[PDB]
Each structure stands twice: as structure tokens, then as C-alpha cells.
Design a protein around this ligand. Sequence first.
Ligand code: HEJ
Ligand code: MN
Ligand code: ZN
Length: 384
Amino acid sequence: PTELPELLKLYYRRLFPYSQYYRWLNYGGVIKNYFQHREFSFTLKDDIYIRYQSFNNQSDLEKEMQKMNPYKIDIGAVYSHRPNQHNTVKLGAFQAQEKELVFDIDMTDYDDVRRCCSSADICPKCWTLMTMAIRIIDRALKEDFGFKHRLWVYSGRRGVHCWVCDESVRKLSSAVRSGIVEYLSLVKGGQDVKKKVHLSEKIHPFIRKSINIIKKYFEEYALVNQDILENKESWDKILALVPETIHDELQQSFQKSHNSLQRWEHLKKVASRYQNNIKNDKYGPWLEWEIMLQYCFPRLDINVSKGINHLLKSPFSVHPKTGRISVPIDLQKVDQFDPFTVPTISFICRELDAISTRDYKKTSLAPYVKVFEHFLENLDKSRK
Ligand SMILES: Nc1ncnc2c1ncn2[C@@H]1O[C@H](COP(=O)(O)OP(=O)(O)OP(=O)(O)O)[C@@H](O)[C@@H]1O
Ligand SMILES: [Mn+2]
Ligand SMILES: [Zn+2]
């Protein structure tokens, strides 16, 4: 904590990838005042922050960042005027106009289905949730919606962010954004609700494909690492998600079995023989899927995404509570992403001057900048 000022000064002077950052938020300079009308919000010492900050170009941003040395950096929306001049504008005229479509996934939202961590804690046993969350959401954005430019970022403590930056996506309204969220959402209800997933008879392709993703991980994550069917205290939470008329049949089988794998197979067979609708003789795995979805499907903080003017932490900003750097995630190596090897600001400041040019390529931050650059090159191609 007390070390942050001098470390931040070195970080913002020799390590922050300014050229790549400007390339991103300038979007080729094709539109006028697109970067000049962008809100940045800097958090300083003592939880003090300033909103409606904007800059004229890359140089002006470098000088202001090296002058303020903010603990945290938030990106806002592109406004109708210079945010830093918003007080000169007549009331009602200053309006948010465009912003990337953003998603924020917090591991805390899985506390009800996590047996290893709680609150802002994370560990390798439960990080697979984020692995599934990236694969499920990113597929839907890419394949179902046609979005081509998606930057996934480690938030620095307990989850991940996604920046969808296609120029028409940046123009979407709040209504369409919330509609996209609704399309993507399946786990609904707070701690009040016991069963948070309910499927229809007809399965929409989105649901099928997400389930097929979860099936690739469910054994190692849920039945081994989490051991969701370890004892009665654990498998009673799953029995709370199925009808009561099959509790007894499962209770016995679980006690006769010895581990979660066997008990899960019993659950699948029993659930597939349960008769939902007495009119027809139709049976299926709806319950099986509802359980898997309730334990593995992305839980999206809905309000982050519907608001055009919502602030989100900038990539390559530091998390002031962990010292970690918000780094992009290599989509080609999503399963191998290890949040516990993400460098802290102290670590890369050490690597810079550690004896065995003086920039980020001399540290462990480089490969993450390469991920960011591949993202930027795809954007450049889309413009040509
Ligand atoms: N006080 C605040 N005012 C305005 N925006 C705020 C804010 N505190 C946070 N935000 C914005 O919400 C994003 C998500 O919050 P959180 O999930 O707690 O932080 P994070 O950046 O995702 O990092 P983690 O702790 O989740 O890993 C913030 O990024 C943004 O500032
Ligand atoms: Mn978050
Ligand atoms: Zn954990």
C-alpha cells in the first residue's frame, strides 16, 4: 500500500503501453473527436477520484497520467462534447453517445455454488468457472451476434471483463444492450431463490451449445475439485433443485455410492426417467441441465452492461487492493490462463531494473501486451 506511489510513477513512466492504448481508444482516427470526447476517471490516494476527464492526444494523456499517477483508471463513454468542458455546455446538451459493450463477471456471484473460496477469494479449483464463462459468452458474442472484436481482460482480483468494440456495437442503445444480456442470461434470482435455472421443453441453440461447453469441464471441476456430491450436507443443495418426489430414490442411491461421480450418474438416470408433464409421456434431461447450468453458467452483473455511461476499469490499470495488473487474456490459450502468475506492479518494477531498452519488453508484462496487439491488429484490418 505505502509503496504504490513510487511504483506507479515508474510504471506510468516506463511500462504502461501508451501507444497501444491510444491506438485502441482512438479507433484509427476515422471519426472526429472520438478520443477527445472520451471520459477517463482517475482514482488517486485516499479513494479520491475525478470524473469527466479527457485529453487531446497521446502526449496529453501521458503527461496527465505521469502527473497524477492514479491508483486506478476507469474508462467511460464517448460524449457529445469534451467531458472536461462539460460545465461550459448548456444543461441537457452534454450526453453520452457511444461506448463499447462491456461485461463484468465477479466470482463472488458464485458463492452459493463455491465450496473452496468465498467473497473476493479465488483459487485454481474455482477459476474454471471463469474459463467456462469466457467460452460460453465469447462464443455467443462471436457466433450468435457476429461481433468480431472482443477483448477479454483479467480484472485483477476476482473475475474478468469483456470489451466488445465493433463500431456498430459501440453505437448500440441501452435497450439493445439489456436485450443482449437477457439473451445471454440463464441464472436468475438472488439468495432468496433456491432454484435459479428453469428450462423450456424446446431447447434454444444457445442453451444447447453452452451446455455442451459445460459438459467438457463438469467432471473435473464439479465432481472432483468441488466434490458437489461429497456428503449429505453438500448433495442436499442439489436435491433442493429437483422435485421432491424423487428425493428418497436419490437419498438411498447416494448413500450406497461412494463418490460424486457415481452419485451424479444416478442423478442423471433418475432425472431422465422423471415425468414432468402428465399429459404426454415425454422425458428428458432438463433437470440434469438445470443443475449444471446453476453451478457453472456465467452470472453477469446485469447493470454493468445496460448502462452506456457506466465506468469500467481500464486494461493495464492496477488493482489497488491486490497490486495485480488488469491484463488481456489470450483467447487461444484460455484454459491455460493462470491468474496467479499475473504480475504485480511491484514485480515488474523489480524485473525492469533487475541485473543478471528500458520498457515493458524487459518484464513479464510483455506477452500480455502482445495479446493486446493481436486485438489491435484485428481492429486495424477491419478498417484497412
Ligand atoms: N465507486 C465507483 N463509482 C463508479 N464506478 C465504479 C465504482 N466502483 C467500481 N466502479 C466500476 O465498476 C466496475 C466493477 O466493480 P468491481 O467488480 O468491484 O471491480 P473490478 O474492476 O471488476 O475488479 P474486481 O475486484 O472485480 O476484480 C469497476 O471496474 C469500475 O470502476
Ligand atoms: Mn468485476
Ligand atoms: Zn476457490
